[PDB]
Symmetry: C2
């Protein structure tokens, strides 16, 4: 009997080839085993165009209603496509909209396969790089000599200023901010995801240098930990490591990976990504302070693992043991088929297995399905 | 003994490194060279006594002669002030020297084969280059702004954020003058060392990219090609991925904040914060070399050799250059033979090992040296 679901998964459709691949994955790997229950939203460009993007907002809201969504890769509008599709507007990427409705923090993590060798030797468990909003502060270009200042005016009109620099030539000045609210929100999602994934949270700053700004991140994380997560972390023997950025990269490079690593709103994170292998071999997960999740691909492997992360999460929530086990089994089967040497052209240029059979995406999905049946 | 021509500017330092500094001289340099140095005591008591004037004078000695070698020094905190009875919180000398010379610092590991890297394929030192902020705790609602008042009176404002609650703000800067010393120092070093230069990062960053380009076409394009070196600009995400996939051997330049990490990354990637050289370079071409009981003194030998080799090339004295090279090589070979300090024996495998004490290691290298 196929596995029975309860609460539906929010399923959001994407664009172009990933949309074919998404359907191919459902058809070969999920529907045979599970009586899929999803609430469907088409976030391909055409439907976004027709609904003037309302369908994206609807999808986010439905993630709030149910808890979990899974999302196909989508396109960001460009001179051509517009023409190509005759769209009314160059639309902002939906993930930006969905993130802000969810107030979510974003976690990216590699997909480990033994035959794809990390460049850091010991790194065999995925490290999740966490950011509160991944991909965007104010600048001003000084044309000539003068006095640059960082200035704050409170409600009541009181003004305070500090000198940034007294220029004697042209240059740039930059302002950065964070509200307590965004930091608390960042902290909660990080602690959620870490609990949810059963691994330690590491947060690092450079707070001996920045005596006020980084200090605030540090104190809010510690606050949020005590008042909100300490007891849960202990129950599962998870730890929260606060530390200096220098101390953390030395310690993490010395480890086996397998932890959640958060940093201030960028380079530490591409290093992690690249250290493990292609940036395609990667899951991307949005978590909210609230415990809402959306899984997306950061390559059929990423799309498979977006679905299995989502199924596994949806099943944990609903107490469907069978569904969580399915999701683990299908992940293991995906990896195992690569390890037996059947894979696509791109997995092959990454993998070390001595005898490889290269096949197309479709045949690949079919082989994972053969491996799954052997398990 | 190799005679010297122009003096090396030599800056003595603090505590244990000061002793080792002297030990390296006595066992490794003085028996082979007639040390010509102009000597500055940047110990802490002497900085306090001269009220940090000796640090300024040391900096200027480097502008005059061109090359300095410097021992690690204490930067005093509250704790030190009481401990040493300081008159003031003297600034970091590294800090002062840097400013006077307007220099960029390049950090690079020291590689030895028996010491396994954490990163698969990094066989060649990678050199990482780098050239404070105001902050405020927003305590309740209003408006945060960058403001600029031009000396003609005009006042331009940019909103940072409208707060409805508490949070934090920060402001920072960079002058064009600054980006230009940075680019010059990076191109100089890349040349001196026969390495390619990599740089990576809308107004803040394009400003940087523009200025580097300009300085390249106008002042270096020519000298680089004369030695078949590439200047490669690109996006940080691409650089890191190409860098991680290469063998090492380049100069990697980044905005502060980002060279902060990578040198952590690279440092710890190669294996040991102790095995790190540090060389300061100015746009004018002035240089300073510094270290970035059984104590590892290897970064401090390589500071002395770096400076003596550079001094030899500027003074057209080949035996001094060849000696620097020989000693570096003999320092490395000794470790490879399995005689090493406690700290380094946790690192390198290879072997059965005779671990020795600080001064013993120095005697042992000399032995490796006497011994072509």
């Amino acid at each position: 009997s196929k596995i029975k679901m309860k609460v539906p998964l929010v399923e959001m459709d994407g664009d172009e080839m990933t949309r074919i691949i998404w359907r191919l994955i459902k058809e070969n790997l999920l529907e045979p085993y599970i009586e899929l229950n999803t609430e469907y939203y088409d976030l391909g460009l055409e439907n976004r165009d027709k609904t003037e993007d309302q369908v994206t907002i609807d999808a986010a809201r439905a993630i709030q209603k149910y808890g979990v969504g899974v999302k196909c890769a989508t396109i960001t509008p460009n001179a051509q496509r517009v023409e190509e599709y005759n769209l009314k507007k160059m639309w902002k990427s939906p993930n930006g909209t969905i993130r802000a409705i969810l107030d979510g923090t974003v976690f990216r993590a590699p997909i480990v396969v033994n035959s794809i060798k990390p460049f850091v030797k010991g790194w065999k468990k995925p490290i999740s790089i966490a950011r509160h909003a991944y991909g965007d502060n104010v600048e001003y270009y000084v044309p000539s000599a003068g006095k640059a200042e960082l200035v704050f005016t409170s409600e009541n009109g009181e003004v305070s200023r500090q000198t940034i620099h007294e220029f004697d030539g042209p240059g740039v000045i930059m302002g950065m901010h964070n509200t307590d609210k965004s930091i608390r929100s960042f902290a909660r999602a990080c602690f959620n995801y870490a609990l949810d994934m059963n691994q330690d949270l590491w947060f690092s700053t450079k707070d001996t240098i920045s005596k006020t700004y980084d200090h605030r991140f540090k104190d809010i994380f510690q606050e949020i930990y005590e008042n909100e997560y300490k007891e849960k972390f202990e129950a599962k023997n998870l730890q929260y490591f606060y530390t200096l950025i220098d101390d953390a990269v030395a310690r993490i490079i010395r480890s086996e990976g397998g932890m959640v690593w958060a940093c201030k709103n960028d380079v530490m994170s591409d290093m992690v990504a690249s250290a493990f292998g292609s940036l395609a071999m990667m899951t991307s997960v949005l978590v909210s302070p609230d415990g809402k999740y959306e899984f997306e691909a950061a390559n059929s492997m990423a799309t498979i693992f977006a679905w299995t992360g989502a199924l596994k999460k949806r099943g944990e929530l609903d107490g469907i043991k069978e569904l969580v086990d399915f999701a683990t089994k299908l992940e293991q089967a995906s990896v195992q088929t690569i390890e037996n040497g059947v894979m696509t052209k791109d997995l092959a240029s990454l993998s070390e297995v001595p005898e490889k059979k290269i096949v197309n995406t479709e045949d690949f999905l079919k082989e994972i399905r053969k491996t799954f049946e052997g398990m």
